[PDB]
């Protein structure tokens, strides 16, 4: 039995009306008759603290980056889901703020999974719901997707599906009428199919790369110390792959 | 058996050193050892058109652009390939313009599989290796394989294996010691095992996503026109998802 | 007399050590020479609130959006400096969190001058100062920069001054000695000489420019609706400039 | 007297019908009135050698590189323009691959005025129009003027002006109304007005920054190596900005 769960990243809490949230209304009964059960999170409802501390950092600085909050309580759902669906409006040509910090914080996981020696968020499955007034969702599903499978992820074609309108100030999805807009609807079955069947291919064919084995090997044929020498007597910004500076002989 | 494609799209012609052929020196060995055949094309050693035509274009402008040349050739080898990956150097923070002109004539099939009712790329596998001398290996990843993933590609975790100096001007991969980057060889080995990995399971369990079986589920809930309604008395370009102008009436 | 305002983005509170910081250490004096005020404010040490409202959200929920915080406070700093300088961390190949909520919040002026009939912070300069640990200068830069030109900032060249260590997990610029760093340092002195050169130039002549004037000659020759037919009876998505489905007569 | 050179980067030979030359067509008049020369060039009717060559590359290899072409006919162009208007359709989230080409060899120039210590390009002016079906016009105004700043063009406020219609795959400006849409309109005003007035400016108050003194002053408080140690013990990938490797001490 495999879970998907759906983040809607929006910036107004609930009820307020999200435009966003009309993709998840209609990928969420696909999603249950592909037999997939789903959760939607409205990050933006809960308290998900944006501030950093680790043991370099200054510790009475990092007081508030410690405090009791609700991300252990989301990062377990993330973990325990099957398909991730990050389903986020558009600002500033990016994923909104609050997508922002649920990646910043999930990218802080460093743990290797007992027993596989991957990383753990492997073999499970992301796909893409976005919403903008007119544009950036190619260059939203990039970016996303791309920091998602660094984590783990795999992602299927035409794993994102958005709604834009023309270029504009708006309106958006639901005076636009995008839940009776061709494009979108037919882009939202793509990706509810594609991840589906991803997901179930993994869940019973896992990935078996052992990541550990594979860094041994690239310790075995490499250095452990990285070094160039830089022409300094020149304001010149353009990009030279020779420049015949002679290599940096190190100590020891 | 598994037929993986390494596109080098360096804009030097054969035998220049190519920085980027390095990071293929070592996926292809890799490859082999997971008994995944292998070839390498520099494409730029091939004679692609770039110009445009199709039948809304005037003929004899076209004439240039419709000639003959390898682009069959090469397409040919992208259809039979399992794995394609696009092996770049990173120019202007994107892809070279050699890349970029086979990725736009791969955009141009406009055919649907028979038989599965998919795209003609749906089941196989991409991966990236990418060499800069700074800066633009992420960038350039959620680019091309966004778009790849439209096309039909899946693209598994880590899949994306570069090489990158600091902030400068150079030296690239060859001078900079790449071969011996520890990150750069143990990316490249993530890169090799997923991909394998990835593109064994999808010849043994193929998508079943009927596309036209979507697209007439989409129909049936949407409609054939879109329309908004805009204010045309302001300067702003501030967005707002309401604008409450009142819905469009069309004829018949 | 021109200001500066250089905004630290990073995600841990003052006082622990920020590697962005280094960055600004080096710009600071140099604008003093140039003889601009420079202000440094490390956004996350104030109570800036992230969460959306207006009229047309839900009025409870929004409660917690329009409480009282810093954010009056930091806006009218903004709009008082002639040059504004993002110092941004990298986080995600794009601007931190922090940079993003502060974006998202100016973006939402929904104002024109007087007077002049300009966006409020027409007239003004923008640099960047960005650190990553290995890659994403460009990409932030362009996005970033692209956002502040649609608010009013101009940008003269080498705006964006960074350091980015090699492919790689770190470390960053402090054990980098990214201090030390020629490529880096000789950007900043870029940026800084060329932001406070154009800062003092639109302080002298800024731009005439009446946006309600083009706005007003852009009514006059456009429509007041968006409308196109759509092909509903194709699952493809490949691109067709021309589709010959007619043109969509509206009501009155 | 200002000159503009406009590049329309279509792939498509005259007179085929250009979805672009569209929104040229608005600008061109725009920039007359203003008093500006303008001329318009499409790249792709002229003979731009794509591949490279260099004294590093095989002599042989280079010939095509090296042959007769009309690059030194239109760099001259550039090189004259006060103000560069980049035209380019939106392909694959990016300018086409024939405004790529021309970037590429513009990004070649090795030179520095005279005189002035400054990059050639210094003091003049970029804008953009851009061109597509849905999607990437920010993606591509963030990659294209970030791109043209680091050569030394300024970017004023509201620079890019573009046209995309909603989420779709068409159809483009000619068949959409491109012409009468209110928002592009207003953008190109918006574009032409403030790029003359930048150019204007920057003719009278041209950048005194001397790039070289720039780069003296970084030469003397930055090192000539470049070096860090790696950690080479772990499959992670997950950034550290602190990792106490130790510093490296390079010989002599
Ligand atoms: C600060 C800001 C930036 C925006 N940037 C963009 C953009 O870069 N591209 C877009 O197509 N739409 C955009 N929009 C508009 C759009 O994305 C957003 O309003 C809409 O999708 C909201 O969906 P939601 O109800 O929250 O679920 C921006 C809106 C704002 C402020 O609310
Ligand atoms: C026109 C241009 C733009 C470049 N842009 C970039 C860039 O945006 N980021 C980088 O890290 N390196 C870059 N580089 C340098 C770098 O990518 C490239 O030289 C190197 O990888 C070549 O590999 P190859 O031998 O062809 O296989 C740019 C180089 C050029 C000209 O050759
Ligand atoms: C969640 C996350 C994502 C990061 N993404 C990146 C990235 O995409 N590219 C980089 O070069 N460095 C990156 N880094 C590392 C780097 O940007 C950052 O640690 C460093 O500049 C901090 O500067 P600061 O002390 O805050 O002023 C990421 C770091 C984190 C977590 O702290
Ligand atoms: C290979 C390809 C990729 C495209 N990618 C995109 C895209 O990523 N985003 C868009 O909005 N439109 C796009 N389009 C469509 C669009 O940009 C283009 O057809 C249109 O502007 C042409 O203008 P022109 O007549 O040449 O001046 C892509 C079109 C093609 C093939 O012609």
């Not at 980056?65 to 099957?82: M, N, Q, S, T």
């Not at 970016?143 to 299927?156: A, E, I, K, W």
């Not at 052992?210 to 010149?236: G, H, K, M, W, Y």
Request: proline letters at 4%.
């Amino acid at each position: 039995a495999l879970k998907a769960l759906i983040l809607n990243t929006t910036l107004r809490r609930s009820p307020s009306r999200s435009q966003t949230q009309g993709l998840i209304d209609k990928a969420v009964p696909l999603y249950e008759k592909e037999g997939i059960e789903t959760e939607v999170v409205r990050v933006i409802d809960h308290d998900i603290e944006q501030e950093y501390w680790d043991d370099y950092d200054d510790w009475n600085a990092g007081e508030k980056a410690r405090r009791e909050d609700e991300w252990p309580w989301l990062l377990e759902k993330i973990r325990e889901a099957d398909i991730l669906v990050i389903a986020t409006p558009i600002t500033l040509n990016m994923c909104t703020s609050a997508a922002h910090v649920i990646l910043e914080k999930l990218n802080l996981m460093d743990e290797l999974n007992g027993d596989t020696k991957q990383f753990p968020l492997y073999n499970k499955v992301a796909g893409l719901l976005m919403c903008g007034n007119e544009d950036g969702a190619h260059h939203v599903a990039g970016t996303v997707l791309n920091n998602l499978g660094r984590l783990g992820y795999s992602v299927p074609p035409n794993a994102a599906a958005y709604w834009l309108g023309p270029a504009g100030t708006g309106p958006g999805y639901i005076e636009g009428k995008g839940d009776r807009h061709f494009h979108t609807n037919k882009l939202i079955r793509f990706m509810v199919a594609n991840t589906s069947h991803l997901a179930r291919m993994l869940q019973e064919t896992p990935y078996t790369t052992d990541l550990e084995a594979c860094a041994q090997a690239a310790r075995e044929e490499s250095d452990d110390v990285f070094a160039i020498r830089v022409n300094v007597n020149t304001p010149a910004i353009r990009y030279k792959r020779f420049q015949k500076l002679g290599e940096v002989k190190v100590e020891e």
